[PDB]
Amino acid sequence: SLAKSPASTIQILGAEKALFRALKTKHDTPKYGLLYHASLVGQATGKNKGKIARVLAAKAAVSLRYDALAEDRDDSGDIGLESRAKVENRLSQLEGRDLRTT
Amino acid sequence: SSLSDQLAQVASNNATVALDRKRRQKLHSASLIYNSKTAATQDYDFIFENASKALEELSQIEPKFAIFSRTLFSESSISLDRNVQTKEEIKDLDNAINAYLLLASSKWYLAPTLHATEWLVRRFQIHVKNTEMLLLSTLNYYQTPVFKRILSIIKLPPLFNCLSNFVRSEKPPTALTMIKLFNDMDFLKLYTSYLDQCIKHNATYTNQLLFTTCCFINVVAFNSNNDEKLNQLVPILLEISAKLLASKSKDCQIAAHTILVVFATALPLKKTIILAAMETILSNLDAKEAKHSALLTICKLFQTLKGQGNVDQLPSKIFKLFDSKFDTVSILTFLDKEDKPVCDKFITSYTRSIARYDRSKLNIILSLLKKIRLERYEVRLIITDLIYLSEILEDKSQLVELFEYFISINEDLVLKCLKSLGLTGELFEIR
Amino acid sequence: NPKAFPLADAALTQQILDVVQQAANLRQLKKGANEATKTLNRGISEFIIMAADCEPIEILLHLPLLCEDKNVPYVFVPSRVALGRACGVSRPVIAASITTNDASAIKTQIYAVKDKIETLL
Amino acid sequence: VKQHLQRETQLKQVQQRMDAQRELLKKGSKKKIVDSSGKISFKWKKQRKR
Amino acid sequence: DESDINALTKILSTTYNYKDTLSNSKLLPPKKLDIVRLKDANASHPSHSAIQSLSFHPSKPLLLTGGYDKTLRIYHIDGKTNHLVTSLHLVGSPIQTCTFYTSLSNQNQQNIFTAGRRRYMHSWDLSLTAKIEKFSRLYGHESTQRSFENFKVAHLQNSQTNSVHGIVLLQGNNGWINILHSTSGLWLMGCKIEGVITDFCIDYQPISRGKFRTILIAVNAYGEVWEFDLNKNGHVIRRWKDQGGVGITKIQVGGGTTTTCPALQISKIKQNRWLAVGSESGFVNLYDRNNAMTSSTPTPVAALDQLTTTISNLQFSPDGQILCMASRAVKDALRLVHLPSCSVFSNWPTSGTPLGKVTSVAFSPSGGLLAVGNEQGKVRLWKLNHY
Amino acid sequence: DEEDIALEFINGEKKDKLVNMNSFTSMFDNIQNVQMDTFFDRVMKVLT
Amino acid sequence: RIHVLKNIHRESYGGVTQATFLNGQPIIVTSGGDNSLKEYVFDPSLSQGSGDVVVQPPRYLRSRGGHSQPPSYIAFADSQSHFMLSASKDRSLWSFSLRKDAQSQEMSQRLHKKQDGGRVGGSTIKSKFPEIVALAIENARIGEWENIITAHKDEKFARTWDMRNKRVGRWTFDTTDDGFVKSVAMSQ
Amino acid sequence: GPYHIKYAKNGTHLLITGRKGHVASMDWRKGQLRAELFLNETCHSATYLQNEQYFA
Hints:
Largest sheet of chain F: none
Subcellular location (chain D): Nucleus, Nucleolus
Oligomer: part of a larger assembly
Number of helices of chain A: 5
Helix content of chain A: 55-70%
Protein name (chain F): NET1-associated nuclear protein 1
Largest interface: B-F, 44 and 31 residues
Order of helices and strands of chain F: HH
Number of strands of chain A: 0
Subcellular location (chain F): Nucleus, Nucleolus
Number of strands of chain F: 0
Number of helices of chain F: 2
Function (chain D): Involved in nucleolar processing of pre-18S ribosomal RNA.
Function (chain F): Involved in nucleolar processing of pre-18S ribosomal RNA. Required for optimal pre-ribosomal RNA transcription by RNA polymerase I together with a subset of U3 proteins required for transcription (t-UTPs).
Shape of chain F: elongated
Radius of gyration of chain A: 15 Å
Distance between the termini of chain A: 48 Å
């Protein structure tokens, strides 16, 4: 039931009361939810923790529905590990940029 | 110019002299260990005695700090004031400070060097007088709090201008800021002089070589789309490649190999520059990892070579030098590797130099060109100079079995070269 | 891939990707697996196209599981690259949902392709 | 249940018009296509997204 | 100090330039072209329509333009003063494809074949009055060929004599390519592919001394490609599939003798190295036929994606080092992609190149010279200084 | 036949990787205490 | 090798004919056969500790010059006999002073913007206008608008210039009959 | 104009006056000026009073 949910839901999955009050009046929705306490979002700083909460929820949807829907799964962490490498170098490339002018 | 401009010039000259108590407090509160309220109340004797303790620790780690205990960290230097002696004494103690800084550039991960260079910061004011050498020495450590500390207390030179938004900031400078720092030309000349002093006094350490090579190849990558900036940039980085190849460190030699391979694949250099580059590569080749990088470097530098003249026989001096550094087993083994490097034009030039300059080792060229596959113009030039070898000297079994290989593959091409020069019945009557 | 049930042959996949191209021009498709599942949840999808070309196919084969709950047709085409070309973006597209409309110009083409899909179920 | 159905279909139609307007103001080339009646639609140029 | 492993330092202290000089290059540098602009070729005599097709002569300095204003013009091109040689207005026959054909036997015919959305195709015999003939008989096959628009002219060998003759190849309705003689107009053979035929090209491969073989390469709209050997009866020898690609508009070969870089002498016929399949999204797959004739699901060496609307021209330079993608859908949609590196030249065209709405393109067989015809009726002319 | 020799010379040219602006930006992350020969083959993997 | 100043003078007129450092000074005066005399200066080094190894390249300082080819046309700019306009075969329009030779200045050929907002044609590699056949200056409305009207060799339009700004003007008058401009005039 | 010079009685501050109008009181040994005033009539001389804090 978690695997058949879209990645945006997996992003906002913990923050339902903030989400639905910010939808039932026309306000801005949260961006973290239950996924805020992941170590990668801990490594991010600024608005790009919203950004990598989004990319982490996307890769977590990929890995999660692989885990729930695979049959020849090996319990070895391969898809989760390549997804984590994707999220880590993405976090690198948006922590390398800086809004200052040098 | 204006009066406020001329007075800013005299302020920048008199930056280090404490002319009253408030300037002395603002100028002595610039520490590298303590905060300002402790650092303003400390003495010279206190910071000297624990810096002398830390220099004894640093000297038992590395024994080249004992002469700095003799001169820069002695007890006459507690009372030695910097801006009271003349220019000649100033240049004496500033090359003393430069010697200490490029010796202790490697040690910056362990707290005795922080507590020891604390005394150079607070007695000799090297954060505002000897500041370019301080930044250049600790440039590698830019993700670390010790570089954050020297940026907070530094007065930034005009060449280091892009770090001016990372001073007194909580976040480290980024790698793109480091590439923007290195992308200047005057900064590149400054850093290559710094490396020349490093290579001269034999202090090049591998973390520095990694950082230096990374920033250099990123400068070349950034300037890869403007040929005039690449052409401004060639006699700087090829000069520092020559000065890194002219030393003894295997790490700095393969750093120069990395710089040369990125630069030759970024722009098509001249043939003679590539040949002199391989001569400088081979002229000091002593290690094994250096030999691995040197063979890969010479292969790629010959690969990135176009036009009429890419696959000539490399001349007699450089071919026998390449023979004395790399014999037959090394070349044959490296070609037998399953990773398949691209060694086309270099191996063609090598076999043509064997046919013009060795004339005994032809079974090995049969085996190696059995191993790797070449192009039509490569094997056309190979069989043309084998035809000339048959016409100059008597044709024995090694040249015969070479022509049996060149008959067993692509016999139409050897017919085309014989019909361009000679005849097939006449050549079979020859051999 | 074996576990990609109904896979289209060449003629059916050519007309599927033709109706995908004209729905992309009419701004009537949601491209991407998460947007396809959102249209599946909201019940505004006509049919789902998936690609039997993704190297984990289990990132796909979960929207079949809620297609067979809302009896919406779904089909597989062999190329994610070609599905991305048809959807008209620069990336490969793994799944695409053609959304519902009743004033649409290509309603007859959508209905014809979805009947040809639900023949092979 | 019948008036839940009427509310749901009216909300579907108004969200469909809202979504068409939002889709219209994004970017790309488009033209105003008019039918027999006057129900206008916007046909987008065959050009993929860069 | 001093009076007068240092090899690199010495060679740097003597050299002042550090790159290859002029002619010791022999193959193009990537990412930066060298392309000057000459006088616009049809600037002497303006065109009254969009310039729909464009071809150079195989030997002479002649450029043939033609469009929907049912006239075709030949221009002696040079740098300065591209003048008009002659000009023929076929009434009631707008032209869409016009080609210089020059036979391999005597290289003395110099025909111009031209055709539009008509059930006929004209053939002007160049004689410097004008004797043109009209082909209007499909010899029993008129139902499968209702318009002579998309033709291509090629060479064919008898393969029991060593006698070559030109064929024209007409793309018809169902999947049909009707191949017919370029002098007698007799229907020789026909090749049917399965789908919507969208484009086709001609490859040649040498066999021995004085014998070659003609291959027709025809693409479905969906992306599957047939190769027909047609020096024998028009029989399929290979059937493969384009990786990706769903709306396929244009296939081209290059690197050897195409129909646009034609061989003047039969021993100068070369096998084409590259094959570009350009699509409706602007994606151009690029296949390298030195290895992609064996796989039957071959992968492209690169898929270019730089221009975003429908590929309507893609032409290879005669050496086979540049491909020219071009689209007649938006303005200024032309790119020159260098190859083997498969990287687009980034310095040309700029934002101020007067390319227009590029509706035809042509490469010179000898001069290294682009002609680009746009919808305003202007052939613009550029010279690549590598040649 | 010099045109045929020139065509086979330009025909025997193989596809290479060109340096971009950002072909070497992701090396600072792992220049930390690795050896310089591992840096050399990490660069050579980018070049090939 | 510190730096190379390329094309500091014309090779066709002799190259750099005499270059000398004013002694004790970082300024070097060059002179060439193209009727030109330049000065180049070395700024002090940009690195505050190294200096001797980071040598800032020589930059340009004052220079005097004239025509490098014999002049083809001549006019007087005003009634006071102070300035005179002078066009040469090396495709430059100078304004020479009869009172003080420092006031002699080359009229600039940096074009204005197009009036509607479209692009202007021409080559990217900017070269000078074709050499001047005729010109006509009438400084009744000077500073107000375009003031000099000039006619070039084998081209079908006449440019304008502003003597006050010492630059080209916004207008190129066409002939409208595909003929080259053989004469110009302007009213008073 | 020509600058009449004046120092404070300890040498910390300098007071210059141009003949034209330019009077500047400054800390000549740091780079701190604390008055630069252009009094466009011809000034002749100046002096500090008991400090750098007042000058006539």
